[PDB]
């Protein structure tokens, strides 16, 4: 449609365009933290992988 006609979202639609998802991003942090803690407890970089 020509100029002079725009679009806006409402309700649930607002946050979808305001951003997607970031669950995978945080799931990685929880793994690095656990790896670091286990490495400190074991005193070795190789065991925490098990």
């Amino acid at each position: 449609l020509g100029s002079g006609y725009s679009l806006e979202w409402g309700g649930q639609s607002r946050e979808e365009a305001k951003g997607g998802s970031q669950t995978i991003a945080l799931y990685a942090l929880a793994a690095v933290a656990v790896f670091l803690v286990l490495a400190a407890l074991y005193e070795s970089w190789s065991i925490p992988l098990a």
Binding site: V37, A40, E43
Partner: protein, 50 residues
């Protein structure tokens, strides 16, 4: 304190990595500016009496 860590390099490395991560996260959420906020608040009242 110094004798405890002389035998546990990995635990010290873990603490250092935690500090580095915290610093990066803090940097990621800091506003930038020229000078700190130094101006005091002011309120103005407007009246008309033709």
């Amino acid at each position: 304190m110094a004798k405890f860590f002389i035998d546990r390099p990995i635990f010290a490395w873990v603490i250092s990595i935690f500090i580095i991560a915290a610093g990066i996260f803090g940097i990621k959420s800091l506003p930038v500016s020229q000078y700190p906020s130094v101006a005091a608040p002011t309120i103005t009242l407007h009246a008309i009496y033709p």
